[PDB]
């Protein structure tokens, strides 16, 4: 089996990409945040705290005649940008692009923390990551991907997130009309349960390809591309009046600059980030000081390769017995 979604994002910024996922008999479309940086998928629900929705679309388990409860279970999960959810389990029927699992654990929210109540244009997360960091206890679950691989016809899925625009995930195929050139291949380690891997290195704008290694996860849940402070700076003093904010919360620049692209490599080949896609405009409304989209992980305790990396790229999340990422420019 394959499927195909496409995913749109929720603003101007690219803040986060959502794809249409059917729950549950009659199916319940809810547009969700595939995040390859965990491994839940949870949904805004008839269960969640109604004080905390505002204007997400609910799944109602009591309306799916597939929906069973996953008696005694309970999850809770707190992500790196300080949000967090909680509630209980149901097991139901999940489409993504025509591709179903049926079984597939779905984490009813009961709480929702502010930062998911204010956006009303996701209505929950699908994880992508390894299994191991999911948190239903005391009966761990598996991922949407984890259910469905042994069924695909070749167990993997891909992310093409685009540039201000609509992109696709695809499960069990790789759509080789998608990218240019060849795709390169990268080792992942599961160690922690992320799609971790070692950039070879990074180039400023035409500047020379400094050869590092940079460990890092390819994390779609992730908004900008967190890197070490000493690569944050290198990139930020090839702009003019660009500075570390303590006060903002990171490096910001002057609207009026055109940015450098950004360059990283994956083994021997190299993917160029545009200059354009690390503007994340003003950072309040009127203002003439934009905000950046590197920035240093410093503090973080990881890299992060996320959208602002990954959407210069295809990326393919290859589930074969020994993971690998692939990593293609387009």
């Known amino acids: 089996?394959?499927?195909?979604?496409?995913?749109?994002?929720?603003?101007?910024?690219?803040?986060?990409?959502?794809?249409?996922?059917?729950?549950?008999?009659?199916?319940?479309?809810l547009n969700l945040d595939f995040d390859t940086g965990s491994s839940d998928l949870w949904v805004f629900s008839s269960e969640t705290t109604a004080s905390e929705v505002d204007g997400q679309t609910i799944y109602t388990p009591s309306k799916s005649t597939?929906?069973?409860?996953?008696?005694?279970?309970?999850?809770?999960?707190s992500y790196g940008d300080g949000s967090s959810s909680s509630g209980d389990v149901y097991t139901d029927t999940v489409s993504v692009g025509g591709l179903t699992v049926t079984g597939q654990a779905v984490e009813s929210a009961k709480k929702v923390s502010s930062?998911?109540?204010?956006?009303?244009?996701?209505?929950?997360?699908?994880?992508?990551?390894?299994?191991?960091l999911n948190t239903v206890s005391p009966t761990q679950q598996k991922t949407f991907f984890d259910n469905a691989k042994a069924s695909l016809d070749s167990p993997v899925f891909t992310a093409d997130l685009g540039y201000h625009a609509p992109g696709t995930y695809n499960f069990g195929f790789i759509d080789t009309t998608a990218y240019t050139g060849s795709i390169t291949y990268t080792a992942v380690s599961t160690k922690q349960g992320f799609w971790e891997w070692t950039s070879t290195g990074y180039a400023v704008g035409s500047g020379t390809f400094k050869s590092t290694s940079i460990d890092g996860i390819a994390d779609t849940g992730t908004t900008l591309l967190y890197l070490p402070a000493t690569v944050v700076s290198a990139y930020w003093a090839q702009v003019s009046g660009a500075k570390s904010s303590s006060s903002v919360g990171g490096y910001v620049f002057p609207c009026s600059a055109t940015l450098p692209s950004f360059?990283?490599?994956?083994?021997?080949?190299?993917?160029?980030?545009?200059?354009?896609?690390?503007?994340?405009?003003?950072?309040?409304?009127?203002?003439?000081?934009?905000?950046?989209?590197?920035?240093?992980?410093?503090?973080?305790?990881?890299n992060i390769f996320g959208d602002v990396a990954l959407k210069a790229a295809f990326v393919v999340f290859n589930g074969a017995t020994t993971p690998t990422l692939g990593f293609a420019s387009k």
Not at 10 to 29: E, F, K
Not at 66 to 77: D, E, F, H, P, Q
Not at 265 to 276: C, Y
């Open 66 to 77: 597939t929906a069973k409860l996953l008696s005694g279970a309970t999850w809770s999960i």
């Open 263 to 302: 360059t990283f490599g994956v083994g021997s080949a190299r993917i160029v980030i545009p200059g354009d896609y690390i503007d994340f405009g003003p950072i309040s409304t009127g203002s003439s000081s934009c905000f950046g989209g590197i920035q240093s992980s410093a503090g973080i305790g990881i």
């Open 1 to 29: 089996s394959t499927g195909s979604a496409t995913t749109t994002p929720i603003d101007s910024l690219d803040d986060a990409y959502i794809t249409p996922v059917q729950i549950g008999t009659p199916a319940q479309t």
């Open 115 to 132: 930062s998911f109540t204010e956006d009303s244009t996701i209505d929950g997360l699908l994880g992508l990551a390894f299994s191991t």
